[PDB]
Amino acid sequence: GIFANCIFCLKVKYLPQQQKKKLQTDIKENGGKFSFSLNPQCTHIILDNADVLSQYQLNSIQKNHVHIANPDFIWKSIREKRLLDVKNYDPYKPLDI
């Protein structure tokens, strides 16, 4: 599926439970894996609007080339049946991270 070889750290604490579940099932049903912890093996980190990242986390993300994205990256990729350009879904783009 479109998320093959993708490992998503999910930081989506403030999403409704139904949406958290749907993000997870969208990821798993389309070849991806997810974790709630950020580690070097993560390829992506999904951040809802109300979640933020520490400087420590941002440093880890830079070092390990993790893509920061919003939930829309998942929703839209699923809708379009195609892995989209993750650079257009980066909440920390304003910081150039």
Side-chain angles (χ1 to χ4, degrees):
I2 60 175
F3 298 136
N5 294 303
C6 299
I7 304 166
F8 295 91
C9 173
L10 303 180
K11 293 302 178 178
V12 293
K13 176 175 179 174
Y14 297 97
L15 291 186
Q17 190 56 237
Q18 202 179 2
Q19 290 177 25
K20 293 175 169 167
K21 291 251 194 302
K22 187 59 169 179
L23 205 69
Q24 293 169 18
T25 60
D26 280 356
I27 291 167
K28 279 220 73 197
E29 286 166 353
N30 293 282
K33 294 200 306 297
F34 65 85
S35 63
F36 297 113
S37 298
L38 173 63
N39 57 56
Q41 290 72 63
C42 298
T43 61
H44 295 70
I45 183 168
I46 305 300
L47 190 73
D48 67 347
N49 258 308
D51 274 83
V52 298
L53 296 170
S54 71
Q55 189 55 56
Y56 172 76
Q57 290 174 306
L58 289 174
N59 291 346
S60 297
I61 287 167
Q62 177 213 352
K63 185 184 183 184
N64 296 116
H65 317 277
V66 181
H67 297 306
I68 306 173
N70 60 31
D72 281 351
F73 178 62
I74 306 302
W75 304 140
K76 290 200 51 176
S77 296
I78 289 294
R79 173 166 294 139
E80 293 184 44
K81 289 184 179 162
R82 186 170 66 71
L83 186 66
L84 301 182
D85 186 352
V86 71
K87 304 299 196 189
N88 298 340
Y89 296 87
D90 185 351
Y92 274 94
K93 174 147 191 167
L95 276 55
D96 293 342
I97 308 172

